[PDB]
PDB file of C-alpha atoms in Angstrom:
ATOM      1  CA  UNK A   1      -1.147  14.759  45.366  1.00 45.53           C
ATOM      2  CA  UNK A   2      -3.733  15.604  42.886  1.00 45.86           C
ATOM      3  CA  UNK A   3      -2.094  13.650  40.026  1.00 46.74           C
ATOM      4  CA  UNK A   4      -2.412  10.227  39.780  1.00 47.79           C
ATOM      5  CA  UNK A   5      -0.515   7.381  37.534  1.00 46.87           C
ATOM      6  CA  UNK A   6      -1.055   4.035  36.010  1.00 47.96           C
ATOM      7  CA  UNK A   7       1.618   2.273  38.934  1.00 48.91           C
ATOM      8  CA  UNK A   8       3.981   1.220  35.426  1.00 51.04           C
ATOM      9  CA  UNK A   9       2.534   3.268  32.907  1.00 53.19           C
ATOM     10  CA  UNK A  10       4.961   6.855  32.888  1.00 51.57           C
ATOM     11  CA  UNK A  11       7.286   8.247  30.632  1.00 53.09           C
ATOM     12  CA  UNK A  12      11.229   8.387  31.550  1.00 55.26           C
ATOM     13  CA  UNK A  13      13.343  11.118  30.461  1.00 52.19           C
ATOM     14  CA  UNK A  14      14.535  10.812  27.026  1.00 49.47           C
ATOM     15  CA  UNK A  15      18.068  10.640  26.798  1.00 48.56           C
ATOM     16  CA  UNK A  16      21.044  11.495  25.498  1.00 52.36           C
ATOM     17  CA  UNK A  17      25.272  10.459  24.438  1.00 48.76           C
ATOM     18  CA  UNK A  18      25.660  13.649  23.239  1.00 47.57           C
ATOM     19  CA  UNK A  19      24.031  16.975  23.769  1.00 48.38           C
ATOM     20  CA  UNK A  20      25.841  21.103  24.070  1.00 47.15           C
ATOM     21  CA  UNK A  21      26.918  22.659  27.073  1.00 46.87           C
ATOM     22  CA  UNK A  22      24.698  25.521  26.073  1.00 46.27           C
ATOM     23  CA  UNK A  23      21.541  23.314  27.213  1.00 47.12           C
ATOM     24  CA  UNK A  24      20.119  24.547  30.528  1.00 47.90           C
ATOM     25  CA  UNK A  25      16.962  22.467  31.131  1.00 48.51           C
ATOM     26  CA  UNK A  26      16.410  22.878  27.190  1.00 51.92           C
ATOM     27  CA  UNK A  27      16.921  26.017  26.714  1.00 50.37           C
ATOM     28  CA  UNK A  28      19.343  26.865  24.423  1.00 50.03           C
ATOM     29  CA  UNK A  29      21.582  30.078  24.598  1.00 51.10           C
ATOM     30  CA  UNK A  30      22.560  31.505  21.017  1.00 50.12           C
ATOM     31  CA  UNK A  31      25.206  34.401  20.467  1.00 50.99           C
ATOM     32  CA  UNK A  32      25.456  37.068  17.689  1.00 50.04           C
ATOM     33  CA  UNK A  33      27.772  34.292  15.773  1.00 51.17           C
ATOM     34  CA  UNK A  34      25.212  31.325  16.002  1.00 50.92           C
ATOM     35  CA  UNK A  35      26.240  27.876  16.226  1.00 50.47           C
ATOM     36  CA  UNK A  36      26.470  24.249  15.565  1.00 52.21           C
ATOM     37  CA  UNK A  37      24.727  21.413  18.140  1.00 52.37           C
ATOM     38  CA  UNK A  38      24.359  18.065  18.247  1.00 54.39           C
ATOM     39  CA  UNK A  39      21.950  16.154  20.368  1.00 56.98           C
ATOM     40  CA  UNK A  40      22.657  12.267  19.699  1.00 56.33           C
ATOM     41  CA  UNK A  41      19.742   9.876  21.676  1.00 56.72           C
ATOM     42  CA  UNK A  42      20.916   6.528  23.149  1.00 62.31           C
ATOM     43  CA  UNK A  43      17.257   5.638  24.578  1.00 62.18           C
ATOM     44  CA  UNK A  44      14.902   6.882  21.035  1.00 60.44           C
ATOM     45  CA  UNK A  45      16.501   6.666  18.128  1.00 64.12           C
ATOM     46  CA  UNK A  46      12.870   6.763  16.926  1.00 59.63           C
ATOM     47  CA  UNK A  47      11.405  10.442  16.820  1.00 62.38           C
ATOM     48  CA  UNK A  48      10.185  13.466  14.289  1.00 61.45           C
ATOM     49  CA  UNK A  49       9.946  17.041  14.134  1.00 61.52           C
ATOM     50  CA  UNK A  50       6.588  18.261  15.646  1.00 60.44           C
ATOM     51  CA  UNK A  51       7.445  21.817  16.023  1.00 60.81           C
ATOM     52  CA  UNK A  52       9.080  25.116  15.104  1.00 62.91           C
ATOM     53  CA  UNK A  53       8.987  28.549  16.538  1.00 62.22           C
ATOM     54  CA  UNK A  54      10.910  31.546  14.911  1.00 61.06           C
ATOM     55  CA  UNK A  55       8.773  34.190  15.420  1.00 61.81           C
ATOM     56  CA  UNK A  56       7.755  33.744  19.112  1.00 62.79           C
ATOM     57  CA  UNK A  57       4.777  32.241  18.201  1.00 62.28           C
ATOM     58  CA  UNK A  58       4.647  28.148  16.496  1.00 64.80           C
ATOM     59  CA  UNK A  59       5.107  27.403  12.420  1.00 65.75           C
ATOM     60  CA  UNK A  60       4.210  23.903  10.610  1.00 67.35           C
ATOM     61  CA  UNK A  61       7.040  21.994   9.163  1.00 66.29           C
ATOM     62  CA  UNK A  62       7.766  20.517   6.022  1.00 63.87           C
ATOM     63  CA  UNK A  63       9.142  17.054   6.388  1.00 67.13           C
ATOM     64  CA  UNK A  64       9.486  14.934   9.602  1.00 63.51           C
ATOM     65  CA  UNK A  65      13.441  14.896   9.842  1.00 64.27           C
ATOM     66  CA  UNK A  66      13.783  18.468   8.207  1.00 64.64           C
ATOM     67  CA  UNK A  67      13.382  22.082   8.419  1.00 68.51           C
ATOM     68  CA  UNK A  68      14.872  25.105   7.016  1.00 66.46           C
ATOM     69  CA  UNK A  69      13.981  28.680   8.476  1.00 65.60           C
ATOM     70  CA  UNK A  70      16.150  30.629   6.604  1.00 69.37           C
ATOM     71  CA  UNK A  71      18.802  31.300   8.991  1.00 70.00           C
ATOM     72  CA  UNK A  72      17.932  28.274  11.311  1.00 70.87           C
ATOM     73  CA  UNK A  73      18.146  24.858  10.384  1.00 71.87           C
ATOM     74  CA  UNK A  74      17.118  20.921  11.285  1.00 68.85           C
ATOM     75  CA  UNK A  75      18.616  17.558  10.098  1.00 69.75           C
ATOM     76  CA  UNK A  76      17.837  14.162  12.147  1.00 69.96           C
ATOM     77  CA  UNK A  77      19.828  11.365  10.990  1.00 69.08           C
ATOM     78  CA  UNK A  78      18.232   8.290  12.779  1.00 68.78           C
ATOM     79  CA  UNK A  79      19.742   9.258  15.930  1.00 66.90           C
ATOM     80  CA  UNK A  80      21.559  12.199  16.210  1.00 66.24           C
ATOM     81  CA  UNK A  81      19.402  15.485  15.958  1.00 66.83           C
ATOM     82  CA  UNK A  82      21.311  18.811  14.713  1.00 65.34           C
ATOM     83  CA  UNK A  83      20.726  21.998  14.601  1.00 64.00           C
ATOM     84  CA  UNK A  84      23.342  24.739  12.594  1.00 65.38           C
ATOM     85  CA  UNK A  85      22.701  28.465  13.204  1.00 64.17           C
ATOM     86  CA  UNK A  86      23.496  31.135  11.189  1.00 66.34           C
ATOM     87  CA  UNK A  87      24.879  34.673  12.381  1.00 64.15           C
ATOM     88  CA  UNK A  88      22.513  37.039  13.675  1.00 63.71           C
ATOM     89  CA  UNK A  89      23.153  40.935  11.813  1.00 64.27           C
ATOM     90  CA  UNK A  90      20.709  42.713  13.428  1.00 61.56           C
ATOM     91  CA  UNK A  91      20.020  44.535  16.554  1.00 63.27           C
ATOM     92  CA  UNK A  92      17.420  42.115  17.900  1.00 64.69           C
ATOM     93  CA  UNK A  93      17.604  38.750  19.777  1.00 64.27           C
ATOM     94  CA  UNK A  94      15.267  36.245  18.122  1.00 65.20           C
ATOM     95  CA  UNK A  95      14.176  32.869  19.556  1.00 65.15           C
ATOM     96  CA  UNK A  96      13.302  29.182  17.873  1.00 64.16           C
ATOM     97  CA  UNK A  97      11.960  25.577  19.605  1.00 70.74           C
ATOM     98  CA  UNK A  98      12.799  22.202  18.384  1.00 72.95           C
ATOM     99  CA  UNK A  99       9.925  19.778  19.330  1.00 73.14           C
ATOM    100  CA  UNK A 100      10.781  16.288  19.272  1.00 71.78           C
ATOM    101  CA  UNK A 101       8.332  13.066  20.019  1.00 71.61           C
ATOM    102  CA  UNK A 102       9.156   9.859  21.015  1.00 74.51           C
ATOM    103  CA  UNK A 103       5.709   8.267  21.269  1.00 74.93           C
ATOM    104  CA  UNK A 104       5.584   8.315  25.042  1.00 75.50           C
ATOM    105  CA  UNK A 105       8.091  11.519  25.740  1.00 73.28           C
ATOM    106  CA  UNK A 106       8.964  15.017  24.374  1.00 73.75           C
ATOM    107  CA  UNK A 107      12.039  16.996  24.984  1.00 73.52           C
ATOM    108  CA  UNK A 108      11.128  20.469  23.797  1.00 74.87           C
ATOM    109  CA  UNK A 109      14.088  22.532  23.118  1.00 74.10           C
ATOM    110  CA  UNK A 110      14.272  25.962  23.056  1.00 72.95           C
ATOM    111  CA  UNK A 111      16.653  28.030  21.608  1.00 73.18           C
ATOM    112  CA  UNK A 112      17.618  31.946  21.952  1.00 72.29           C
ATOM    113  CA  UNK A 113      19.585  33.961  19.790  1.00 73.20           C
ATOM    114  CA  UNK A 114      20.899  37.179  21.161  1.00 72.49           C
ATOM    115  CA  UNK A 115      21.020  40.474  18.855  1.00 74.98           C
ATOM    116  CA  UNK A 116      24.690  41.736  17.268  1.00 74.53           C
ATOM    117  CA  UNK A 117      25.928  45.160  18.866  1.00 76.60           C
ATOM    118  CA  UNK A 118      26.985  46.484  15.514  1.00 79.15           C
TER     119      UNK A 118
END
């Protein structure tokens, strides 16, 4: 116990057609290459960016469908979410988070890059 509800009043999971085998309860695994992913919603198609991380720590973002971290990337087109990650040169992993609203639901996402071996 110690929670309690309105009896109809919770928030289902949001979901997803299409999301990357690299999700593990939102946590995204990166390599030394970096990759595409695509994360298209079937129950929200009705969201915005509401945060970054790059830096283990939380940034602001510039637009609500956008952002641009250099070598990390955003785009939402109405439904389907991206991300496209560039290749990591140096000899440290380095970690992001995608933050995502619905009104009544958030999947956070959380991504982490591993360093090259170079």
């Amino acid at each position: 116990g110690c929670e309690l509800s309105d009896p109809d009043g919770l928030a289902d999971p949001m979901k997803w057609s299409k999301v990357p085998s690299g999700l593990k309860n939102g946590e995204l695994k990166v390599e030394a290459e970096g990759g595409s992913s695509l994360f298209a919603c079937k129950n929200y198609k009705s969201f915005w960016i509401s945060s970054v991380k790059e830096e283990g720590k939380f940034k602001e973002n510039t637009s609500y469908k956008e952002f641009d971290g250099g070598w990390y990337l955003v785009k939402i087109e109405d439904n389907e979410l991206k991300v496209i990650i560039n290749r990591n040169e140096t000899n440290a992993s380095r970690s992001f988070t995608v933050c995502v609203e619905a009104g009544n639901a958030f999947d956070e996402f959380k991504f982490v890059q591993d360093a090259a071996k170079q």
